[PDB]
Structure formats: structure tokens, C-alpha cells
């Protein structure tokens, strides 16, 4: 309702004694979003990724790279055909709002029961000996039954994997190695022997197989983000850049709130973010046109309320600490001030102190004892 009732709410008493009190900081809220992405209009090749004529054998898992295109990932989330669409870097409903630096698609087929091994940091012979995501994987895993498209009556034995490996191979590696394994200690020079194995074995994908012994098409879609220039984005539309106004910006999925301004920072042809000492974003290069924008947070500060105490009066005065009085007219209900009251802001008596802008209190040359300490030599009191 007013700064006095906000102090009563802050103090949990319906009486407030004579003094000065902190309360909630103020800030000015953003009047619009702004969206900024590097305009590109060609769709990403997800039909090529999912509608392949044939998929890899998983020990040879096919690796595709994507760039410079638009991805409406929600189309793929909507396609009810997917028996699993499990996502780690993001919730899948977010994907349309994000931009990525690089996008890699890993593709093969497997028995639908081993889809659990595809999840990051798991174990089991596939996850162990031929394909695995790192601890800090950032993407989605997708799976679907392919019995109709990919079974042969006696089995498409074409789809094989690996039963043997000298050591658990590194994350995101592939191994073509056809070398005979030496499960017993004898050096099995040549192509065969007792205790020696051809290192790969295959699925008899007969159509009569049990659900998940059936052939399942698998893709992992994956990406890295928020440290380098984006090349892929969702379908959202860029909007007019503005300076010297509070805006809920998004540049390349780098969302935030602030006042955009023309940067004097001379970024070389390669960089795209500035970051302040607090590891937090403070400049960005515009993706539509190559200039640098400085980004400052919108105006804010501590409110402190000065009171002669409710026994004496329900008049208060307000200090906006650290604030020059010329920003208090900019604290107007054009946007919702977080302290929602705003009746002192009408002014006629506004005073600038070293501590911040003081409002509601008549400045006078007649000095007195420091009755309520505002700060920096200024005090206040209740008088005719």
C-alpha cells in the first residue's frame, strides 16, 4: 500500500517505533523482450538424420555434423512414433528457444531392450565396449521399434556389434579394429584358434523376436552451447534492438535483463561475449549485425524508510540509497516497481544526499542533534 505498511510488513508489528529501516530493494522491470539470432532460414536435415535408407552397425556408429540452419525440434517431440525421447542437456520442450554452437548426430540400430545402456555414464556391453556418452553429456537420446522396416525373416545379420575389447574405450570414440581377441593368454597370431575370437557378433533380427529383442532405430542428438558463436537455432523471430531502455533480452539463447548500450569494447573478429569479474555476462556481439552491445543491469537499489514512529505520525520519508534524484522520475509505473507503492515519487520536495535521494523530508539550514541518522552528515526529525 505505502512505504510505512511495507516497513510494518518487514518488521511484523502494526506499530513501528521512531527510526530508519531497510526494506526490499527496488528495481525497474523490463517493458518488453528482445530476441536476437543470426538470420538463417534453411531447415536442418532431420529428415536425412531419421529417414536413412539404412542405419549403421553400432560399432561403426555413423556420426553426422550439422550447421547454419533452423531446427523446429518440437516437430520431432510431437512425432508419437518415438518409444523413448530422453533428454539431458535440456528439457525437450525448451529446444525451440535455444541456439547451439555445433550439433552432432550419432546413429545406429540396437535391440530395443538395451536402450537403457545408451543413457550417459551407464554400463553393459554396448555402453562398455563400443559406444558411450560422457558424464556431462548435453543432448537427447531417441529410440523406436523398426521390426517392420528392418527385420528379415531369418534376420538382417548385417547389424552387428562388438563382444570384445582390450579396454573400455573412451567417451565418444569408435573402433573399426577387426583384430582377433586373445581371451586365453596364447598369442593367437593369424585369424583363428582355440580361446581366440573374431571381435564382433550380430543380431538375428527375425520378426518373431520378443519386444526389444526386435530391431530399434537409435539416434543421439547432441550439442555444445553458451561459450562460442552459435550456428544452429530454433524457429523464434528476431525483434528490434533498443538502447537506453530496460528489456528482457535474448541473444543466441543468452537470456537476461538490462539496458543495452553501444559498446566501446574493441572485440577482435573472433569473440562474441564479454563477462564481468563475477563470471557474469556484461557485453555481447549482435548476431544480425557484427557490433558489440554493452549490457548493464536495469536501475535498482536499497529502499530505506524513515519514520517518527506510528505513535507520533503515519507520515514517513523514503531514501533511495545510492540513487541520484534524476533517476526517481524514471521510477514510474510505466513498469511495475518491485516495491509496488509510489506515492512519495510525486516530489515537490525531492532532496539529493551523498547516501542517495531522500523524498518527503523538507531540507532546512537550521541544524539539530542527529535525531534519525540518514547518513553522510544528514539526519531527520519531526518538527512544525
Amino acid at each position: 500500500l505505502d512505504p510505512l505498511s511495507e516497513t510494518k510488513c518487514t518488521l511484523k508489528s502494526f506499530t513501528v517505533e521512531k527510526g530508519i529501516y531497510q526494506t526490499s530493494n527496488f528495481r525497474v522491470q523490463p517493458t518488453e523482450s528482445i530476441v536476437r539470432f543470426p538470420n538463417i532460414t534453411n531447415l536442418c536435415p532431420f529428415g536425412e538424420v531419421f529417414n536413412a535408407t539404412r542405419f549403421a552397425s553400432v560399432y561403426a556408429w555413423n556420426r553426422k555434423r550439422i550447421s547454419n540452419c533452423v531446427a523446429d525440434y518440437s516437430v520431432l517431440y510431437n512425432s508419437a512414433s518415438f518409444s523413448t525421447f530422453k533428454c539431458y542437456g535440456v528439457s525437450p520442450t525448451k529446444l525451440n528457444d535455444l541456439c547451439f554452437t555445433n550439433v552432432y548426430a550419432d546413429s545406429f540400430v540396437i535391440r530395443g531392450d538395451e536402450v537403457r545402456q545408451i543413457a550417459p555414464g551407464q554400463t553393459g556391453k554396448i555402453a562398455d565396449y563400443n559406444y558411450k556418452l560422457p558424464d556431462d553429456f548435453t543432448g537427447c537420446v531417441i529410440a523406436w521399434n523398426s521390426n517392420n522396416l528392418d527385420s528379415k525373416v531369418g534376420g538382417n545379420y548385417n547389424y552387428r556389434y562388438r563382444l570384445f575389447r582390450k579396454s573400455n574405450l573412451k567417451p565418444f570414440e569408435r573402433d573399426i579394429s577387426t583384430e582377433i581377441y586373445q581371451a586365453g593368454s596364447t598369442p593367437c597370431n593369424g585369424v583363428q584358434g582355440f580361446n581366440c575370437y573374431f571381435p564382433l557378433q550380430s543380431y538375428g533380427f527375425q520378426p518373431t523376436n520378443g519386444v526389444g529383442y526386435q530391431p530399434y532405430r537409435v539416434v543421439v542428438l547432441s550439442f555444445e552451447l553458451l561459450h562460442a558463436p552459435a550456428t544452429v537455432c530454433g524457429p523464434k523471430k528476431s525483434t528490434n534492438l533498443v538502447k537506453n531502455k530496460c528489456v528482457n533480452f535474448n541473444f543466441n539463447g543468452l537470456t537476461g535483463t538490462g539496458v543495452l548500450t553501444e559498446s566501446n569494447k574493441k572485440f577482435l573478429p573472433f569473440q562474441q561475449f564479454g563477462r564481468d569479474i563475477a563470471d557474469t555476462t556484461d557485453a555481447v556481439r549482435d548476431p544480425q549485425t557484427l557490433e558489440i552491445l554493452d549490457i548493464t543491469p536495469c536501475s535498482f537499489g536499497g529502499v530505506s524508510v524513515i519514520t517518527p514512529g506510528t505513535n507520533t505520525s503515519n507520515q514517513v520519508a523514503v531514501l533511495y540509497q545510492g540513487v541520484n534524484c534524476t533517476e526517481v522520475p524514471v521510477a514510474i509505473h510505466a513498469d511495475q516497481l518491485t516495491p509496488t507503492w509510489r506515492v512519495y515519487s510525486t516530489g515537490s520536495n525531492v532532496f539529493q544526499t551523498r547516501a542517495g535521494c531522500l523524498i518527503g523530508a523538507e531540507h532546512v539550514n537550521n541544524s539539530y542533534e542527529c535525531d534519525i541518522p540518514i547518513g553522510a552528515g544528514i539526519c531527520a526529525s519531526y518538527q512544525t
Binding site: F172, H227, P229, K265, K266, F267, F270, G274, I292
Partner: protein, 249 residues
């Protein structure tokens, strides 16, 4: 063509002091008037950079290791460093990276190559025209399985790092008035380019300018040193670029 230019003296390895070089921008973030600490593959300061010559007699082009990451530089005139080969055991059983800068363009090409044993690019030495031209190329005999393609339209220094499928090339140019060594006073190598080539690598070589044998090239020297995982502290000036750097080891 593809031919064994075996006309040379064979010599032991040789070293010089690296001083304070092989620093680079650790990620594509701008920063100014600040001190920042990072853990990355970098060149150990004052370590032994290996030192190599092209003379008359002595064309020092062996096939070095390329483990972890590498720093390369050359003291130059007439632009005799024409490119590099980077690869595994090299026998066409893997992909490998070629880069060259011929008279018209830089080429970057990635195939499972069958490169020549002692490659070069060859140039007519003021043959009647009062000028020089590239006529000869003895670099490979095959390139079937290819996987990436590009072509474009004094001390030179470079960093090559090949991590999680990305071959990152950094660079710098300077003029020189110092007779033969790496200078005091230093700079960070700006990130020239990144190629997403995905390949394993084990080994590398450099490609120089040059009746099948008996040849001449300008007096030049090059320097090779290896990146090591180490913690560094760096400052950015008010213009927002690296101007001092220290290793925590």
C-alpha cells in the same frame, strides 16, 4: 609426382630456450583490465623448443610426434613454409589433414591419404621470366576416402591443438631485426581458424618450397615445442588483450 630427395647431411636433435611464448586466448570471451586464471594445454615457459634448419646440404624435414598439442614457429624470408601434414601412423588406413598455401590459395583437405615419403612444393628459380612460379607438387599418390574440404582465395608463429574432434589453429606475424632466435617481449596467438575434422593424430610434418635431385632453397629455420596441461595466470590490458602471463609450475 612423388620422389625421394635423399640429397642431405643427417644430424642429431638440437634445442634452444623457448622463453615466454605459446600463450593464446583460452576461450572466445573478451576481457579487459583484469587478471584471470585457467587450466589448459600450453607451452611450458623456458622449456627446450627443438630447433631445425633449411640450408643450401641440410633440409631438416623429419616426421615429428604430435601428442597432446604442438607449437610451431619459423624465422623466414620468401615464405618458404608452404604448409603442413598431420596424421596417425600414415599409410592410408586412417584419415589425415593436409594444409598448403600455394601461390593462389590456402587449401585444407582431409582424406585417408597416401602421402609421399619426403614431400615438398617446387618453384622455378628465376627461370627466364624475371620471376618465380610453382611448377611442381610431390605430396601424394592417392586421396579416395575424403571427409572435409576447403580452399581460400620475419617470424611466423602458430599453435595447433586437436581436442574432442576440433583442430584449432592459432597464429601470429611479426617483423624481425634479431639475427636468429625467439625474441624477448611476447604476445598471445590470435585464433586464426577451427576445423571440426574429428581425426586421430600421432605425427606431423611441414611442407617447404624448393635432374630429379640437386636443389636449392633459402636459408630458414623453424622451432617446435609441445603443449603440456598447466595452470596459467594472464592479464588483459584496457584495450582488452593479453599483455602478461605466468605458469603456476
Amino acid at each position: 609426382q612423388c620422389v625421394n630427395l635423399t640429397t642431405r647431411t643427417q644430424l642429431p636433435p638440437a634445442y634452444t630456450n623457448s622463453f615466454t611464448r605459446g600463450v593464446y586466448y583460452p576461450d572466445k570471451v573478451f576481457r579487459s583490465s583484469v587478471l584471470h586464471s585457467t587450466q589448459d594445454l600450453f607451452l611450458p615457459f623456458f622449456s627446450n623448443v627443438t630447433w631445425f634448419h633449411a640450408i643450401h646440404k641440410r633440409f631438416d624435414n623429419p616426421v615429428l610426434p604430435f601428442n597432446d598439442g604442438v607449437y610451431f614457429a619459423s624465422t623466414e624470408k620468401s615464405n618458404i613454409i608452404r604448409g603442413w601434414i598431420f596424421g596417425t601412423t600414415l599409410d592410408s588406413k586412417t584419415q589425415s589433414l593436409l594444409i598448403v598455401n600455394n601461390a593462389t590459395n590456402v587449401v585444407i583437405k582431409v582424406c585417408e591419404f597416401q602421402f609421399c615419403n619426403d614431400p615438398f612444393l617446387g618453384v622455378y628459380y628465376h627461370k627466364n621470366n624475371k620471376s618465380w612460379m610453382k611448377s611442381e607438387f610431390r605430396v601424394y599418390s592417392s586421396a579416395n576416402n575424403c571427409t572435409f574440404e576447403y580452399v581460400s582465395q620475419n617470424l611466423r608463429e602458430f599453435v595447433f591443438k586437436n581436442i574432442d574432434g576440433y583442430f584449432k589453429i592459432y597464429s601470429k606475424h611479426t617483423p624481425i631485426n634479431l639475427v636468429r632466435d625467439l625474441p624477448h617481449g611476447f604476445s598471445a596467438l590470435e585464433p586464426l581458424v577451427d576445423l571440426p575434422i574429428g581425426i586421430n593424430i600421432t605425427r606431423f610434418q611441414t611442407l617447404l618450397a624448393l635432374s630429379s635431385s640437386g636443389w636449392t632453397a633459402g636459408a630458414a629455420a623453424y622451432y617446435v615445442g609441445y603443449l603440456q596441461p598447466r595452470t596459467f595466470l594472464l592479464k588483459y590490458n584496457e584495450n582488452g588483450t593479453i599483455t602478461d602471463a605466468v605458469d603456476c609450475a
